[PDB]
Each structure stands twice: as C-alpha cells, then as structure tokens.
C-alpha cells in the first residue's frame, strides 16, 4: 500500500469541494480506505495515482538477472523423496477412490445437482479435481523426461 494525498486549507472545502479536478483518470481504481475517508487525508483533496518506472535497461535487467534460474532446470531428482511421495500419492488418491466411490452411489435420480448442493463433500469429481491428478502426472513425467534425457546424454 502506497497512498499519497495532500492536506488542504479551509478554503478548498467552502469552495467547490472534492478538489479532484475535471478528468476521468483519478477515478480509475480509486478506493480510499474507510479509515482514510473519516480522516481528512485521502479526503481533503484527492488520492494520488501511482506508477512504476518500469523502463527498459532497468526492467529487462531485473527480469533477466534477479529472478535467475538458468541451468537449474536440469535437475533429475528421480526418487530423492519420490518413492515415499508416490506412496503418499497412492494413499491420497485411494482417498479419492473412496470419494469418487461415495459419489457414484449418491448419484440420485432427482437432478443430482439438487443432491450435490446440499451434500457437498469436495470429492475427486467436485473439488479435488483432475487438476491435482494432473499435478501428480506432471511431476512423474517431468522426473521421467529429465532422467531419460540425461540417460541418452550419458554417452
């Protein structure tokens, strides 16, 4: 939070108040806080819009250099913690097995959306969606491809 405002004299309020001048720019995303509204500041004159000097030779330098991960994408990590991770993954999806089980016998013949709203369980089909399974799948294949890529490099 970086909010800038100006203190005003008593004359600004007795004249046409809201010293915000005639333009449609400072009204963009102008949400002063409730404690700022009841104080004079951020209410006396206006709230100043903020901008960041994201100039090149400065911003390109930051993104290229500061957030540096350039040869760290070659990590293999086949089973450093992954054999027990797969044990947990199977156990978690075994819970998904019971959850996706529980769903198929609920499955009522009264527009199951009616049953679902009043009986939310956040099961595999509803909240523990395929995306989590995709995360497990992506983790496996990434370690697979990294191990296999270095295997053929091993010549």
């Amino acid at each position: 939070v970086i909010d800038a405002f100006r203190l005003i004299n008593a004359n600004m309020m007795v004249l046409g108040h809201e010293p915000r001048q005639t333009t449609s720019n400072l009204g963009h995303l102008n949400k002063p806080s409730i404690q700022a509204l009841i104080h004079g500041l951020n209410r006396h004159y206006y709230s100043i819009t903020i901008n960041y000097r994201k100039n090149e030779l400065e911003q390109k330098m930051l993104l290229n250099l500061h957030k540096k991960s350039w040869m760290e994408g070659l990590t293999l990590q086949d089973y450093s913690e992954h054999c027990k991770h797969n044990e947990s993954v199977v156990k978690e999806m075994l819970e998904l097995a019971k959850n996706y089980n529980k769903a198929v016998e609920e499955e009522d013949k009264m527009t199951p959306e009616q049953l679902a709203i009043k009986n939310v369980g956040k099961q595999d089909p509803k909240r523990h969606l395929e995306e989590h399974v995709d995360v497990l799948m992506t983790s496996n294949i990434v370690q697979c491809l990294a191990a296999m890529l270095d295997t053929v490099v091993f010549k």
């Binding site: 990590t75 293999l76 990590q77 086949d78 450093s80 054999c83 191990a147």
Partner: protein
C-alpha cells in the same frame, strides 16, 4: 606401531614374527615382551590371541578394499584353510562388524549392500548436480581467465 596401525597392510603374522617379531627373542629390554609372548602357557595363549587378532584385522581391511575375493586367496591371506576362514568370517558377521554375504557352494563372498533403485538414482542425480556445479565453476573460471589473458 607404524606398520600395524594404519594403511590396511597385509598383516601376514608368518612374516610379522620375523619382520617385527624380534621383541620375542632380543630387543632393547624385551622384559614386557617375554612376559607377554615369551611365556609358555599364557604366552602361547597370547600368541594365539595375536594370531587371530591379525585375522579379523586382515578381514576388516579386506572388507573396505575387495568386494569379491576368491576363497583360496582369502584363506591364504588369513593363513588358514577354507573351513577355518569361513568360521572366522561367521564370527565377524554374528558381531555385525562386517556386511558379508557368502555363497558356500560357490565359495564366493560380497561386501556391498544391494543398492536400492531409489537411492541409486539419487546418487546419480547427486552426481549429475556435482557435474552441473563443476560446469558452473569451470565456466566462470575459464571465462575470467579468458578476460585476463586477452588484456593485450
């Protein structure tokens, strides 16, 4: 002490009784040596206690050096026969001193624990990361030495 303490030398006690066994016959004072080994009954017991002590020492040093050694060579190194060598080998393993597995029909032994594929790929990945770090260090070193060497 310098010979028999470190560097995992072959402690052939048959050779040691003349190479470093002079304390039995004649030394500077040889009074403790005659008390230990020059005695008849208790001396021969301590002679046997030197005889075996170098056998476990030879087995132990062989453990960290040789993975699989043929039965004839190990028995010759232990200055005993096959059955006596395997009996002492059983004496070490029951004390959990060494990790040894023997095929008695084949007379072949192994000292390396079977590498589980989990940690086997872990050390491979650690080997990979060590190589990756070496690439980073070499690249910085050569490029900077390149910079110094072309200041001309």
């Amino acid at each position: 002490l310098l010979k028999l303490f470190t560097t995992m030398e072959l402690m052939r006690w048959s050779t040691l009784v003349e190479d470093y066994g002079m304390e039995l016959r004649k030394g500077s004072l040889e009074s403790p040596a005659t008390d230990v080994f020059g005695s008849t009954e208790e001396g021969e017991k301590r002679w046997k206690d030197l005889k075996n002590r170098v056998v476990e020492h030879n087995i132990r040093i062989m453990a960290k050096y040789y993975t699989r050694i043929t039965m004839k060579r190990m028995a010759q190194l232990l200055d005993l026969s096959v059955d006596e060598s395997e009996a002492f080998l059983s004496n070490l393993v029951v004390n959990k001193t060494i990790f040894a597995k023997v095929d008695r029909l084949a007379g072949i032994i192994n000292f390396q624990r079977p590498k589980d594929p989990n940690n086997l790929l872990n050390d491979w990945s650690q080997k990979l990361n060590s190589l990756m770090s070496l690439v980073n260090k070499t690249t910085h070193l050569i490029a900077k030495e390149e910079m110094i060497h072309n200041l001309q």
